[PDB]
Amino acid sequence: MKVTIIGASGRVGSATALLLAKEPFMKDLVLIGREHSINKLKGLRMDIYDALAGTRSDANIYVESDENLRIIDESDVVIITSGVPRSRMDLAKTNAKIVGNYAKKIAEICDTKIFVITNPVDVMTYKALVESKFEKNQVFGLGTHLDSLRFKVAIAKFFGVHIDEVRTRIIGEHGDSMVPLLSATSIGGIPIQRFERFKELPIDEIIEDVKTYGKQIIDLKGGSEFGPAAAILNVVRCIVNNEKRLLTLSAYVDGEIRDVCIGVPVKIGKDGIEEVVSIELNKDEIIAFRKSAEIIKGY
Amino acid sequence: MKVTIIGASGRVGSATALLLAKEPFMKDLVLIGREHSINKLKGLRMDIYDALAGTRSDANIYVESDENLRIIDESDVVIITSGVPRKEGMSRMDLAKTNAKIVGNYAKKIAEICDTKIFVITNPVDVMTYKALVESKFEKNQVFGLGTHLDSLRFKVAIAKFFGVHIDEVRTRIIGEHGDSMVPLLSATSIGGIPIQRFERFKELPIDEIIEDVKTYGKQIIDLKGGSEFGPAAAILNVVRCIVNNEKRLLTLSAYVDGEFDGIRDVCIGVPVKIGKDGIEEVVSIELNKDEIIAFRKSAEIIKGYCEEVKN
Amino acid sequence: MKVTIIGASGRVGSATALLLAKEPFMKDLVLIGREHSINKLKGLRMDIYDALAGTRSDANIYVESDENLRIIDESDVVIITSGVPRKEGMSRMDLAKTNAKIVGNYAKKIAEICDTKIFVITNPVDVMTYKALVESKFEKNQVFGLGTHLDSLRFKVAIAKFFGVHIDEVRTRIIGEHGDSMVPLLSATSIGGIPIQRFERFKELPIDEIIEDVKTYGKQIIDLKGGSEFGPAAAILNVVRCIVNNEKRLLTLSAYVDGEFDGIRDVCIGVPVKIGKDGIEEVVSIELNKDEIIAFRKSAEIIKGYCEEVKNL
Amino acid sequence: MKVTIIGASGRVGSATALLLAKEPFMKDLVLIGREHSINKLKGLRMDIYDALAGTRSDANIYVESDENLRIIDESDVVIITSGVPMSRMDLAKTNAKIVGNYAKKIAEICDTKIFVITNPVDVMTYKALVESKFEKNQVFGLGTHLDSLRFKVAIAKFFGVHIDEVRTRIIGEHGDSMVPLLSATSIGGIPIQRFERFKELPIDEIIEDVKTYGKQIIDLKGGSEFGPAAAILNVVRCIVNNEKRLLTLSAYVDGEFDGIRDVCIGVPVKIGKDGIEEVVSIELNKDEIIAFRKSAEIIKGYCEEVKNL
Numbered sequence A: 001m002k003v004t005i006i007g008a009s010g011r012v013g014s015a016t017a018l019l020l021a022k023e024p025f026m027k028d029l030v031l032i033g034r035e036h037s038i039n040k041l042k043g044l045r046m047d048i049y050d051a052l053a054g055t056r057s058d059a060n061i062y063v064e065s066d067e068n069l070r071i072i073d074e075s076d077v078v079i080i081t082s083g084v085p086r087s088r089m090d091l092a093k094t095n096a097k098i099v100g101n102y103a104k105k106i107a108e109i110c111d112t113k114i115f116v117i118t119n120p121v122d123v124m125t126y127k128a129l130v131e132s133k134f135e136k137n138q139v140f141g142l143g144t145h146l147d148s149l150r151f152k153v154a155i156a157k158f159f160g161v162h163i164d165e166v167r168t169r170i171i172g173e174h175g176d177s178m179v180p181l182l183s184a185t186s187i188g189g190i191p192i193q194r195f196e197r198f199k200e201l202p203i204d205e206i207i208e209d210v211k212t213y214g215k216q217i218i219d220l221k222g223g224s225e226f227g228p229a230a231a232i233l234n235v236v237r238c239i240v241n242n243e244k245r246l247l248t249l250s251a252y253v254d255g256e257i258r259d260v261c262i263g264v265p266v267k268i269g270k271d272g273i274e275e276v277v278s279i280e281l282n283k284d285e286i287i288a289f290r291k292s293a294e295i296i297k298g299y
Numbered sequence B: 001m002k003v004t005i006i007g008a009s010g011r012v013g014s015a016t017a018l019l020l021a022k023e024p025f026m027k028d029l030v031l032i033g034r035e036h037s038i039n040k041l042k043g044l045r046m047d048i049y050d051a052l053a054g055t056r057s058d059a060n061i062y063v064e065s066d067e068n069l070r071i072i073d074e075s076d077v078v079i080i081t082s083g084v085p086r087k088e089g090m091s092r093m094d095l096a097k098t099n100a101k102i103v104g105n106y107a108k109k110i111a112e113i114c115d116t117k118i119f120v121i122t123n124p125v126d127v128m129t130y131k132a133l134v135e136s137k138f139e140k141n142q143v144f145g146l147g148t149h150l151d152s153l154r155f156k157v158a159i160a161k162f163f164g165v166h167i168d169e170v171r172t173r174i175i176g177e178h179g180d181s182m183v184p185l186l187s188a189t190s191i192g193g194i195p196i197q198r199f200e201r202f203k204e205l206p207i208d209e210i211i212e213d214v215k216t217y218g219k220q221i222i223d224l225k226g227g228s229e230f231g232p233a234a235a236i237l238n239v240v241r242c243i244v245n246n247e248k249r250l251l252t253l254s255a256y257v258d259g260e261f262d263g264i265r266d267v268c269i270g271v272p273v274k275i276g277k278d279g280i281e282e283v284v285s286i287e288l289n290k291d292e293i294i295a296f297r298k299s300a301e302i303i304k305g306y307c308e309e310v311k312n
Numbered sequence C: 001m002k003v004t005i006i007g008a009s010g011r012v013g014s015a016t017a018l019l020l021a022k023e024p025f026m027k028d029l030v031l032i033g034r035e036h037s038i039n040k041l042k043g044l045r046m047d048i049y050d051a052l053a054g055t056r057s058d059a060n061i062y063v064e065s066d067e068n069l070r071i072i073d074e075s076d077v078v079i080i081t082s083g084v085p086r087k088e089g090m091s092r093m094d095l096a097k098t099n100a101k102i103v104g105n106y107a108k109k110i111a112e113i114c115d116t117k118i119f120v121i122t123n124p125v126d127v128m129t130y131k132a133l134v135e136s137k138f139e140k141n142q143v144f145g146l147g148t149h150l151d152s153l154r155f156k157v158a159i160a161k162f163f164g165v166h167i168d169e170v171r172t173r174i175i176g177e178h179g180d181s182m183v184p185l186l187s188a189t190s191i192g193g194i195p196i197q198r199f200e201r202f203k204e205l206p207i208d209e210i211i212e213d214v215k216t217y218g219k220q221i222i223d224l225k226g227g228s229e230f231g232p233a234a235a236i237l238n239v240v241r242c243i244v245n246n247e248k249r250l251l252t253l254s255a256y257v258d259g260e261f262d263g264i265r266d267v268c269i270g271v272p273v274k275i276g277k278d279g280i281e282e283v284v285s286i287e288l289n290k291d292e293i294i295a296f297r298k299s300a301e302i303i304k305g306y307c308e309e310v311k312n313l
Numbered sequence D: 001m002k003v004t005i006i007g008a009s010g011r012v013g014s015a016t017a018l019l020l021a022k023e024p025f026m027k028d029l030v031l032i033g034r035e036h037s038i039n040k041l042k043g044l045r046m047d048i049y050d051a052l053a054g055t056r057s058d059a060n061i062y063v064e065s066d067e068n069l070r071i072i073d074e075s076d077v078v079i080i081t082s083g084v085p086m087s088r089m090d091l092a093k094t095n096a097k098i099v100g101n102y103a104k105k106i107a108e109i110c111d112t113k114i115f116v117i118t119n120p121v122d123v124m125t126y127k128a129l130v131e132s133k134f135e136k137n138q139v140f141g142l143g144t145h146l147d148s149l150r151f152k153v154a155i156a157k158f159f160g161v162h163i164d165e166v167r168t169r170i171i172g173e174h175g176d177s178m179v180p181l182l183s184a185t186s187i188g189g190i191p192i193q194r195f196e197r198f199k200e201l202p203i204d205e206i207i208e209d210v211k212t213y214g215k216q217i218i219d220l221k222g223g224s225e226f227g228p229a230a231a232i233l234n235v236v237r238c239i240v241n242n243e244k245r246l247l248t249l250s251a252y253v254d255g256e257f258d259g260i261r262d263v264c265i266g267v268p269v270k271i272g273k274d275g276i277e278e279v280v281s282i283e284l285n286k287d288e289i290i291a292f293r294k295s296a297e298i299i300k301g302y303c304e305e306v307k308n309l
């Protein structure tokens, strides 16, 4: 496998680079960054080897500037971390330029898949898909995957059940228009509504903590790096091994809502997004989902 | 952890012993079998130590006949595999009684040494769990059997294959007897949290064929190689892992039920159960649709018959 | 990867099939057997999948008879377990020739299909490796045997247990015949890079009893449970993992020795080898002390006698 | 196990916190830092939990300031990362202050083993041993472990053999007074001198790069965070599981080697649940004894000048 991290100098980028360098399937990792980043990245690589300690002697790491993207050729996936820190529309445009440029350059080199993490992730995935000309199945963004994971952990801790028993999600925007799918939330297969303890669940407090998670972690340490990297590693594993798991990622929706990249349920595999799962949403859910889709169409 | 396998001389016992010795928490493994088996049980041990190749030097494996069960003291879990095989000329009741004597005697002897948790694999597993509980006098949380765990796993894998999704995305179960009275719970089956009944390929699910294959798996594998040993041992390994790490998972096991379902009482049957360090932490009660509860009560009656006949 | 176990219906064959099926580098596992075992193998397959419980969806397990060997094509390794047990009343030569027929015919057929590597488990492992390489027409780098790998592992674990160090710190070998003429190499035994001689406790080491047990293990385990199945399967798994990942470890295997040791030539015997994706990449040549080279000679002499009286059947 | 990382806000500290928190033998991890870093460390903890994604529910990470060390009680190991980025003496003394005070407070609160990551690691291990008053089997430092590992990987890459086949060690100071031990280097139990290709080995360039790695990575990214954290994790796993491996660490040496005396220096050691269970005594060749005694002299100088601050 050959993955290219564009923005490997970042926090999420370097965390994910180290995590991927350890997988047995990673054979050619490509760390890309602007020219002033090159030296820095050459250091990252150094340390990434110091950790492997000779275990992966068939592993190869490459460092190149964002000028000579010819090394991207034949990459299975290209993960884009490049972006700028925080008005909302101002940031949308500022980062849209970067991601559109990178997508355009990537498509010129090869027909690959694109994993967008930069924010606003849904609109950034829209811009990437447009400026790449790629098919709707080969471009996707992190979207509300991390928020859904946090929500799942919260529910599981409340109910005192193992993490694997809880299956839920949060579709919508990676923002405040989130739409928790309580209709598609189950414990061991049971709908959560058939538990009596569901009436005691602090729903608003949980969802508010999830909405504010980025704010809190920015206030404390200046941004999340480890957890996002772990989630991205898991998504890459879902792709390379053709695992066909039902994730929640920002994808192009058309009738499943239309002409918008929003956080929806998706079956991920070797061929990227193989399916956008369309399911019946209760009334409030579908209303709020439409609202989130409007806000996301804005940018 | 200190696990004891009574009947480790057998197929399932040997497989389970090998798989448990490989675990990082298995610090003392106790292999019990009748006296004529002692030498064989030593062989097993030797081979296991050959497989580890020194990777676990803190591991002790013991071999003792079923006469001197004092080596069981302080065991976390005692897995009972010892049992007689079904044969032509045996009614279901013949097997129930013949194996009830065995499991009941072993459970009474176990209770005489220590206060531990008993994991019944011997068949008819639901009835044998009932008998182990009766003769051991342990609490309703310390005795349980495999039951429909494996059948539920097979059903889950089948559904996942049909929908072409990862196995971890499918959550389903089969309650009732480890037998033809099985009751798959299609009401509490989901793919990614979505009920399967919302998917449009559900009307295309060959559910009848899947259920037939699950019910007949035992006969098929006995026809081919005389019995199942690898898969049952893997499932038992994961149940023991659920216990030792207090993972609090929602498994499907043969547990004692008293009212948690409508009209199920004084019976060991395959039900949903939250399993952790203290055994059966909870028997999950759930509203079954009309058909599910009708069939569940029928299976409960089938089990109650043999249970009544084996108590004394 | 795609491995083929020829004799999967046996103890070692089935244990190895189970262990290999769990590996994530196993896309195609091919279980071969005589026709009368096709259903037994099917049973095996079923049970294996049962134990996998749907974790491996891209994995495929095939079952076949030993007449349609076309399924063996593109296989990275072919393990040979097919072989007859020594029955009381069998001389060493008798077992040699009987199992020679089997391994040789399987090797010739393997060659007829495609070019692959051949991992001989069948005992007398050294002679069987010789016969397989004969009838395969393959290069010497693509045919090897388990040989004295297990015995070396047992010796190492014993030393480690006595010195109270982790297993990974001990680095020893036992070369030569997988038999009574074993050759423990105390000249090349170290504990933390430090030759075991330098350790004062090497005086107290019960060397003789340890080697006694290493040599008697076979009949000890045959007398109790009838034979070995777990340890050999684990060792075979390690060798296969070394091949697939080109780990380039220095193992101790039955390899063809052409003058790499003084006096040893045209014989398959237990030697140090550097194993990789291309098979035996190097037969490592090292300076034995006096007694060790003498014993290695004699062991090679015995193996050569057997390899000669059987080389044409 | 219950470990406590003093300096968890550092680079190495955070990397090690994340690696340890993933281990299943980690029931209680305690992240200690100065008061001004409290919020920061809290953030770290948050991130760590985010990376665990609910897998470790028996995991308990506690964050606290370096004033309320009461939480350190019952910790199996305490890893000290706190340090300052000057001459050599200047850094030695400045960090001796920090590590000595932390060792003394650790001793006040409870009894434990102290793993010194702070550099100059040999001198700092001496000062931890002093200000803690603990037994010598209880105070060690990373020392020349990483250097030995990089030397081993280089030999492995050259000879085209798996790393696990190479078994080498570098003893002495974590610095230019290093002493690569070619007398105790083997490749599969074969003395590497018996290999002919040893004569074509670029030995000196290898050793120079080993000496320069720290500065080289500091010239690019700021400092080492991942590799040191991995080696630390391996040493802690050897400690907790009583693995009985023969590592190369900074330990107190009292004549176990002919000439060495009252010096915390890098030597071969048998590590277990008891910390340094033994200093392995080896027969070195003339040149290696000479260089090792010189390294002892250097470290003794620094230790003498930082003995009472």
Ligand SMILES: NC(=O)C1=CN([C@@H]2O[C@H](COP(=O)(O)OP(=O)(O)OC[C@H]3O[C@@H](n4cnc5c(N)ncnc54)[C@H](OP(=O)(O)O)[C@@H]3O)[C@@H](O)[C@H]2O)C=CC1
Binding pocket: A006, A007, A008, A009, A010, A011, A012, A013, A033, A034, A036, A037, A081, A082, A083, A084, A085, A098, A117, A118, A119, A121, A142, A143, A146, A174, A223, A224, A228
């Ligand atoms: N749930 C989610 O969807 C999550 C979203 N994210 C988002 O992903 C992005 C990455 O975050 P993080 O890695 O912490 O960010 P950092 O600020 O730490 O890294 C920024 C990266 O972008 C590059 N970069 C910055 N400005 C430009 C520019 N003008 N042109 C090109 N490249 C540029 C930097 O390169 P250089 O070294 O040259 O400055 C560096 O690679 C953020 O937008 C973040 O919000 C991440 C976490 C979670």
Ligand SMILES: NC(=O)C1=CN([C@@H]2O[C@H](COP(=O)(O)OP(=O)(O)OC[C@H]3O[C@@H](n4cnc5c(N)ncnc54)[C@H](OP(=O)(O)O)[C@@H]3O)[C@@H](O)[C@H]2O)C=CC1
Binding pocket: B007, B008, B009, B010, B011, B012, B013, B032, B033, B034, B037, B081, B082, B083, B084, B085, B102, B121, B122, B123, B125, B146, B147, B150, B178, B227, B228, B232
């Ligand atoms: N899904 C499920 O619930 C499964 C249930 N099972 C059941 O578990 C049991 C074990 O099966 P399996 O291991 O294949 O069977 P085996 O016959 O291979 O082994 C059972 C062991 O029981 C012991 N035993 C036999 N007779 C007696 C006796 N009279 N008194 C005491 N001990 C006796 C023997 O060991 P020793 O001589 O040392 O006492 C024997 O090795 C069976 O009843 C089987 O049906 C197994 C497979 C799956």
Ligand SMILES: NC(=O)C1=CN([C@@H]2O[C@H](COP(=O)(O)OP(=O)(O)OC[C@H]3O[C@@H](n4cnc5c(N)ncnc54)[C@H](OP(=O)(O)O)[C@@H]3O)[C@@H](O)[C@H]2O)C=CC1
Binding pocket: C007, C008, C009, C010, C011, C012, C013, C032, C033, C034, C037, C081, C082, C083, C084, C085, C102, C121, C122, C123, C124, C125, C146, C147, C150, C178, C227, C228, C232
């Ligand atoms: N340390 C070592 O190197 C070890 C070596 N071995 C050796 O490996 C071999 C396998 O042992 P084990 O698995 O216990 O023995 P088994 O007899 O249980 O298995 C060997 C298989 O060979 C096949 N076979 C037997 N005769 C013939 C024949 N005439 N033609 C074709 N196939 C035949 C059979 O499968 P089927 O009927 O389907 O063909 C049989 O199951 C033995 O020779 C054993 O000595 C094993 C243990 C350790």
Ligand SMILES: NC(=O)C1=CN([C@@H]2O[C@H](COP(=O)(O)OP(=O)(O)OC[C@H]3O[C@@H](n4cnc5c(N)ncnc54)[C@H](OP(=O)(O)O)[C@@H]3O)[C@@H](O)[C@H]2O)C=CC1
Binding pocket: D007, D008, D009, D010, D011, D012, D013, D032, D033, D034, D037, D081, D082, D083, D084, D085, D098, D117, D118, D119, D121, D142, D143, D146, D174, D223, D224, D225, D228
């Ligand atoms: N091979 C080896 O032996 C290696 C050793 N090291 C050594 O480990 C140490 C840590 O390096 P690194 O993590 O990059 O350093 P950082 O500066 O990134 O972190 C060290 C931490 O020390 C604390 N600190 C700083 N000054 C003081 C002070 N005056 N009093 C108390 N605490 C203080 C700070 O945390 P807070 O504010 O919370 O106290 C700071 O985060 C260095 O000395 C380095 O040389 C590093 C890697 C390799």
